């Protein structure tokens, strides 16, 4: 802005930025699989005792 006033070869009424418009897995449930979860803390403390 002050430099815009300084030099003569400077145009005015310039919205310098012009942008466009702006607006705003499934097989874990598969029937044939025997999908298992673990809770590793429990089984870990369980098998943890296996001093092998």
């Amino acid at each position: 802005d002050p430099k815009y006033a300084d030099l003569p070869g400077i145009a005015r009424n310039e919205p310098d930025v012009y942008e466009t418009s702006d607006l705003p897995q499934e097989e874990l449930t598969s029937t044939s699989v025997e999908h298992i979860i673990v809770n590793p803390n429990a089984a870990y403390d369980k098998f943890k005792d296996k001093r092998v």
Binding site: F47, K50, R51, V52
Partner: protein, 182 residues
């Protein structure tokens, strides 16, 4: 000794064991030695690995099973002792040698060496105070109640015709062959 006497049904293919009064041997599992076949890696893999019984029949394809009672004669003596310890264990006897009386059975035409070695076990490793090594054919006569009978066993590595007289066979008229279904 004032305890229930142990009865040892020395079956060639299927060995058995039990006590007095009963009609079926208290604990039954055949005669074999199931050595392992792999190497433990995961914590959960059992140890000792020369397993008998549930683990044997269970993991047949994982245990190199062998047979000590070859020709009706045990060859894995020490291992058979441990199989008796397996019987002595919580599984079958839950007791000691020194506690219960024991009764060993035998086939005809047996070498003395086997009987001697067995006695070494029975009174040195095991320490039974009431024990004797009996026969098997006369025991089948006790079962039948007969007197002058011919007993024909049918095992895996033993076959003998025992012409008995009142439970006392002629120890000469008896024939014995050490081969069967094996």
């Amino acid at each position: 000794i004032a305890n229930q006497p142990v009865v040892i049904d020395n079956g060639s293919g299927v060995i058995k064991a039990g006590f007095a009064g009963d009609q079926i041997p208290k604990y039954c599992f055949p005669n074999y030695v199931g050595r392992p076949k792999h190497v433990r890696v995961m914590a959960g893999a059992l140890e000792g690995d020369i397993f008998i019984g549930p683990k044997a029949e269970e993991h047949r394809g994982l245990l190199s099973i062998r047979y000590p009672m070859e020709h009706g004669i045990v060859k894995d003596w020490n291992d058979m002792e441990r199989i008796w310890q397996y019987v002595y264990s919580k599984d079958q006897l839950q007791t000691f040698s020194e506690e219960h009386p024991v009764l060993l059975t035998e086939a005809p035409l047996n070498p003395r060496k086997n009987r001697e070695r067995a006695a070494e076990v029975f009174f040195e490793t095991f320490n039974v105070p009431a024990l004797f090594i009996s026969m098997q054919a006369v025991l089948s006569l006790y079962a039948t109640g007969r007197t002058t009978g011919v007993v024909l066993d049918s095992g895996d590595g033993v076959t003998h015709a025992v012409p008995i007289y009142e439970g006392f066979a002629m120890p000469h008229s008896i024939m014995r062959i050490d081969i069967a279904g094996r």
